[PDB]
Every structure is written in C-alpha cells, then in structure tokens.
C-alpha cells in the first residue's frame, strides 16, 4: 500500500488548473516518476471527478510503449495521486515552439508511433482518446512518443458507435464535433492530421484567436499546404483532414489499418515500430534524470514541498502495477 512518504519531491514539472505534476523519486527503488497531485476539494468543486476516474481506469487498462504508464495511484485524506512514467524529453509543443518545423522524416517517425498507440487504444481497448495535441505528446529520454492525459478518453466504443460530449481542445476539434451531431473514433485521425500538419507545416491548418471564428474556418475553409510539402505528406494530410469522417483516412471499419497502408508510411514495418526499433531522429540532450531543460522554466524554478462530499473517499481508487 503506497503513500506519499515513499517518494522524494525534487522539481515542479508543471501546474494545470486542477493540480500539479512533480518530478519524484521513489525511496526504495531509486526510480524517477512524474506524480500528478489533485486536491480532492478542487476535483469535486470543478465537476472534475469523472475525468479523473476515467483517467485512472484507462491507465490501469493500458500498456503500450508509446502511452505513459501508471505505476501507482493512491489516495490520502485530502488528495489523489497518480505516479506515472516520467517523460524526460518534455512536450513536442515545447520542441515545435523552438524549431519552426520538423522534416518530413521526423514527422513520419512521430506519426508512426502515435498511429501504433491509437491503433491499440481503438482496436485492443475500444478507447477513443479525443484530445490529441502537441501538449499531450511527450518524449521519453530516448526520443520516442509518450502520450499523456487520458481524462477525456471515451471507454467502450466499438466499430462506428457514436459519442455526444463536446470536449477536446478548440484548435484541434474535428468538424463533426463542432457540428454537434454525433461523432465516432475518426475524431482521433482528424487530431493526428492536425498534429502532423503542425509538425511539417509549422502552424495549425486553421487558426483564429477567436473560437467561434476558428470553428468557422474548421467547418468551412479548404485545407492548403506550403508548396514545399512532398506529395505523399500532402496526400496523407488531405486524407486525415477530410471534414466528412466517412471520407476520412481511417474512417471506415479498418480504422488505423487504412492509415498504416498509406504510401507516406511505405516500408515502415509496424511491428518494428511497436518494438522501438525505429531510430528516433532527435535524442533529448538530458544529462540526467533531474535535467528539466525541456520543461517550462516558469515551473522548473519553483522550489516547493507540502507532503464527506467536499473531501470524499474514492472507493477502489488505489492501484499498483506489475500485473
């Protein structure tokens, strides 16, 4: 039975609206992790329990080289804690905010890995992730993708079963989610198209500061590309960014498999992707496990330790991995 005294608390990796993430060391083992700490009080006030519980079940029920793993979750009187694989390499958001764009081959690599993980969520777990973006695509120390944040996943979605909940990130929302008229698992391919467009083109395919105008662009504007993008990249992006989910690459019964066959990925062997045999084309230059250079200096520079319906007890929240 795990508790907060099993860990040292070294650095703040970042702070979201419902909690914080702390780079931690487990005393007994020497192993570093990232621990998400949620005040229960905050969770309940914000109607954020369901997401948190969704996150706990999806993480328990998943094991893939490109999905952040859960080691432990446990609770104290006033708090919830998820002890996760630590993505040393930071967010691709950070990386693409410093480089203007990545090469086609670099995006192919990250693309392959994200496909491998979404495929597994869809076909093995019947999970729809729904919040793919650069902020949720993190790198590990070797430079492979680690997807994090599962609180917006939908569990239980099989074939063309539909969903109704308006959620995600505005810039990343698929046209059929903005139409508000039932959506399927092809929303994840629309997100894959947005992230890959950002990797290769250097910007979002549709932007406006104002959401309602953004959404209008997303529903109405024809996609355009920089004239240097190769024809196999364009075609992949065109297929992924079809506004009609029936016409979208990955929108049929074959799902990921249709994307996996696309000539942009030709010669990628999917099993080798799964075994991490692809050469990551950017290795993070981390000296050590406490080197947080790829994280936001906003949060990194801070040195802090802190160790009934408002503060309930979450039945069967706790969990330990290795099984």
């Amino acid at each position: 039975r795990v508790t907060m005294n099993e860990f040292e608390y070294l650095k703040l990796l970042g702070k979201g609206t419902f909690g914080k993430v702390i780079l931690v060391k487990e005393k007994a083992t020497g192993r570093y992790y990232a621990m998400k700490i949620l005040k229960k009080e905050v969770i309940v006030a914000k109607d954020e329990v369901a997401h948190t519980l969704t996150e706990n079940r999806v993480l328990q029920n998943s094991r893939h080289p490109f999905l952040t793993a859960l080691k432990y979750s446990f609770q104290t009187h006033d708090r919830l804690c998820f002890v996760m694989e630590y993505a040393n390499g930071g967010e691709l958001f950070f990386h693409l905010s410093r480089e203007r764009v990545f090469s086609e081959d670099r995006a192919r690599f990250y693309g392959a890995e994200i496909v491998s993980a979404l495929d597994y969520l869809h076909s093995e777990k019947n999970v729809v992730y729904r919040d793919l973006k650069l902020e949720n695509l993190m790198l590990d120390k070797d430079g492979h993708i680690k997807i994090t944040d599962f609180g917006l996943c939908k569990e239980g979605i099989k074939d063309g079963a539909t969903m109704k909940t308006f959620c995600g990130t505005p810039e990343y929302l698929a046209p059929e989610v903005l139409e508000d008229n039932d959506y399927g698992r092809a929303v994840d391919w629309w997100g894959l198209g947005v992230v890959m467009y950002e990797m290769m083109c250097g910007r979002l395919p549709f932007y406006n500061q104002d959401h309602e105008k953004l959404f209008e662009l997303i529903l109405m504007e024809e996609i355009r590309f920089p004239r240097t993008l190769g024809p196999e990249a364009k075609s992949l992006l065109s297929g992924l960014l079809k506004k009609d989910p029936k016409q979208r690459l990955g929108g049929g019964s074959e799902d990921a498999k249709e994307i996996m066959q696309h000539r942009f990925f030709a010669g990628i062997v999917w099993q080798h992707v799964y075994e991490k045999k692809l050469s990551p084309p950017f290795k993070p230059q981390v000296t050590s496990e406490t080197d947080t250079r790829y994280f936001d200096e906003e949060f990194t520079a801070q040195m802090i330790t802190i160790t009934s319906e408002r503060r309930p007890h979450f039945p069967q929240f706790s969990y330990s991995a290795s099984g």
Binding site: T17, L96, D131, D149, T165, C167, G168, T169, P170
Partner: peptide, 10 residues
C-alpha cells in the same frame, strides 16, 4: 509558435 492551448468538456 502558437500560444499553448487548454482542453475543456461540456
């Protein structure tokens, strides 16, 4: 570089 984004649900 675009600004950082936030998710939502409702």
């Amino acid at each position: 570089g675009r600004p950082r984004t936030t998710x939502f649900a409702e």
